[PDB]
Amino acid sequence: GFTEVPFPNSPEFQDLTRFAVHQYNKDQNAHLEFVENLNVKKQVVAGMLYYITFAATDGGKKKIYETKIWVKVWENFKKVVEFKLVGDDSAKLGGIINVPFPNNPEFQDLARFAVQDYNKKENAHLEFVENLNVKEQLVAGMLYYITLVAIDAGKKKIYEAKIWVKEWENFKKVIEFKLIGDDSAIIGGFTDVPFPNNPEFQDLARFAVQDYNKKENAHLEYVENLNVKEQLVAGMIYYITLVATDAGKKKIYEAKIWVKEWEDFKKVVEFKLVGDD
Secondary structure: OOOEOOOOOOHHHHHHHHHHHHHHHHHHOOOOEEEEEEEEEOEEEOEEEEEEEEEEEOOOOEEEEEEEEEEEOOOOEEEEEEEEEOOOOOOOOOOOEEOOOOOOHHHHHHHHHHHHHHHHHOOOOOEEEEEEEEEEEEEOEEEEEEEEEEEEOOEEEEEEEEEEEEHHHOEEEEEEEEEEEEOOOOOOOOEEOOOOOOHHHHHHHHHHHHHHHHHHOOOOEEEEEEEEEEEEEOEEEEEEEEEEEEOOEEEEEEEEEEEEHHHOEEEEEEEEEEEOO
């Protein structure tokens, strides 16, 4: 349980608050100004957790906020795990930020946790393979958007798991788990691409989208990539998993593009809808 702290505006507590306040202001592009910690609690957890009630003005106007700061001084670690204006319907939700290494074992475990969760709830037998993409969001805690590949009935398919985790509590929970559609198998070895949304790759995916548009009389509107995989052959082949809107509806597609630069050769060999349709 929490515990009252008999020194609200302590230098180290005034420290914690402005750390939170600084991040919010920047991540959100705002200008909260810290005045005074009104109240401070403390919970011994995986490390310490401080629930901080403080006063801030936002261009002259008096406002009360609350933040939950997770700290592990033995790692030089402090993460803001909630930030909220009293009262408001909810906590201040952060932007949905993309995470460049979707297969860092911590997300592989999130993914597996979600796959098993679904296996129990649906009496199913899905089989994880890899993550294609992870997005993170500051909520009350963290929410991860995982786009994964799982083998079902022997066939690779793409699923999306939304999972909520309060890491200081060792707590996690599936918020949403849904089938997107069929994955298209790569066959052979591949190299991953750490940043699937570099200009190089955004231009290739846009090329394929226009190619598909022209060829099927469609009007897909490119949004971004989720994942890029490469392999050297004669020239290079890119396997691109991307989102496009089709009449405002977000869809996922898989493109296969074959490039031979000395030939000025660029060819879309496969472009397929995964799902969301």
